[PDB]
Ligand binder design. Structure first.
Ligand code: HEM
Length: 146
């Protein structure tokens, strides 16, 4: 499963190979996959919608809301960036620690949600242990500033 605290897991060559085998299929339809993931998260955890002021007052037809679609792709693109540089641990650390600080003080998001959205991200793309490890690294780092 996905964890959000403790030492960072290490992605093996095997892990990276599996991730790189599965990702292209998702990436090629990033708009709809990214949207589906966020919508699923909001359906499973309606109480999490309060964490997105840009669409927190929006009810019904979220799929057509520009703020919802944009929020979804911004999250997806960050994951895409990380996958694109799995060989550079330092870059991933630096980048995500900075983002962690922004979510804490600027976006004022409760770090408890990262793991929940990530779980839905993984199940949506039918990812396996390899992706859970990837998202564990991502969540631990996004939770680091808290
Ligand atoms: C895999 C997990 C996640 C990743 C990789 C991620 C990534 C991002 C990125 C890259 C941005 C844009 C940064 C910027 O504009 O400077 C962002 C913004 C934001 N994220 Fe996250 N995020 C994640 C999970 C969450 C969760 C769980 C919530 C809320 C429950 C959340 C709420 C927000 C909000 C409110 C913004 C600000 C949007 C805006 O004002 O334009 N994020 N996130």
């Amino acid at each position: 499963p996905i964890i959000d605290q403790g030492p960072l897991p290490t992605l093996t060559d095997g892990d990276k190979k599996a991730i790189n085998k599965i990702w292209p299929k998702i990436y090629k339809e990033y708009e709809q996959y990214s949207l589906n993931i966020l919508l699923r998260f909001l359906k499973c955890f309606p109480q999490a919608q309060a964490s997105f002021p840009k669409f927190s007052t929006k009810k019904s037809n979220l799929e057509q809301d520009p703020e919802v679609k944009h929020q979804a792709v911004v999250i997806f693109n960050k994951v895409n960036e990380i996958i694109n540089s799995m060989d550079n641990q330092e870059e991933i650390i630096k980048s995500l620690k900075d983002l962690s600080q922004k979510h804490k003080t600027v976006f004022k998001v409760d770090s408890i949600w990262f793991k929940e959205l990530s779980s839905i991200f993984v199940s949506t793309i039918d990812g396996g242990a390899e992706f859970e490890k990837l998202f564990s690294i991502i969540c631990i780092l996004l939770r680091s500033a808290y």
